[PDB]
Amino acid sequence: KLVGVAMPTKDLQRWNQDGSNMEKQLKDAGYEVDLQYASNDVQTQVSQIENMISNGCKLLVIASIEGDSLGTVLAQAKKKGISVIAYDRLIMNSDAVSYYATFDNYMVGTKQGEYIKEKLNLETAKGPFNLEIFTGDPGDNNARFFYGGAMDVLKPYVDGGVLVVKSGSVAFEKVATAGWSTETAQNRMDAIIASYYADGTKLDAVLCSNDSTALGVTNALTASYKGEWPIVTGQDCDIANVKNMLDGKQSMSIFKDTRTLASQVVKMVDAIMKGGEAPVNDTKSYDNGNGIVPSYLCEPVFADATNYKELLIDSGYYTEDQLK
Ligand SMILES: OC[C@H]1O[C@@H](O)[C@H](O)[C@@H](O)[C@@H]1O
Ligand SMILES: [Cl-]
Ligand SMILES: [Cl-]
Ligand code: NA
Ligand code: NA
Ligand code: NA
Ligand code: NA
Ligand code: NA
Query: Where residue 197 sits, what CATH number does that domain have?
Result: 3.40.50.2300
d(CA 203, CA 186): 15
200/266 same-domain check:
no
Q: Looking at the structure, do residues 25 and 158 belong to the same domain, yes or no?
A: no
Closest Cα partner for 185 from 169, 208, 201, 167?
208
Do 75 and 148 belong together in one domain? no
d(C-alpha 151, C-alpha 207), whole Å:
10
Alpha helices in the chain (DSSP H): 14-28, 42-54, 71-79, 105-119, 141-159, 172-175, 182-196, 211-224, 239-246, 258-273, 308
Query: What are residue 134's DSSP bridge partners?
Result: 208
For the chain, what is the domain count?
Answer: 2
Which of 88, 144, 215, 254 is the pocket-test mutation for ligand 1 (most atoms within 8 Å of CB)? Answer: 88
Bridge partners, residue 86, by sequence: 62, 100
Q: Are residues 120 and 244 in the same domain?
A: yes
Work out the burial of residue 110: count CB atoms within 10 Å of its CB; fewer than 13 is exposed, 13-18 middle, 19 or more buried. Answer: buried
**Residue with CA at minimum distance from ligand 1 atom 1:** 12
Same domain, 190 and 210: yes
Any residues with CB less than 8 A from the CB of 14 and at least 6 apart, and which?
236, 238, 256, 258
Contact 88, 101 (CB under 8 A): yes
Q: Are residues 3 and 77 in the same domain?
A: yes
* Position in ligand 1 atom list of the atom nearest CA 211: 12
Alpha-carbon distance 177 to 263, whole Å?
A: 30
Resolution of the structure, angstroms: 1.7
The continuous run of DSSP H or E covering 254 comes out as strand 253-255
Q: Which of 65, 91, 142, 144 gets mutated to test ligand 1 (max ligand atoms within 8 A of its CB)?
A: 142
Asked if residue 213 and residue 161 are part of one domain, the reply reads yes
**Which secondary-structure segment (H or E) carries 205?**
strand 205-208
Q: How many residues does the chain have?
A: 324
User: Quick one: which of 66, 145, 143, 62 has its CA closest to 97?
Assistant: 62
Instruction: Kindly state the greatest CA–CA separation across the chain.
Output: 64
Distance CA 109, CA 145 (A): 7
Q: Give residue ranges with CB within 6 A of ligand 1.
A: 12, 14, 88-89, 136, 140, 142, 180, 210, 212, 235-236, 256
| 283 and 246 part of one domain | no
| DSSP state, residue 292 | B
> Do 174 and 291 belong together in one domain?
no
Containing domain of residue 287, as a range? 1-104+257-298
Residues 176 and 273 grouped into a single domain: no
Tell me the C-alpha to C-alpha distance, in Å, between residue 41 and each of 47, 66, 131: 10, 9, 32
Alpha-carbon span 123 to 118, nearest angstrom: 8
* One domain, residues 80 and 118: no
Say how many Å lie between the CA of residue 98 and the centre of ligand 8: 15
Quick one: 183 and 280 in the same domain? Answer: no
Contact 56, 2 (CB under 8 A): yes
Atom of ligand 1 nearest to the CA of 13: 1
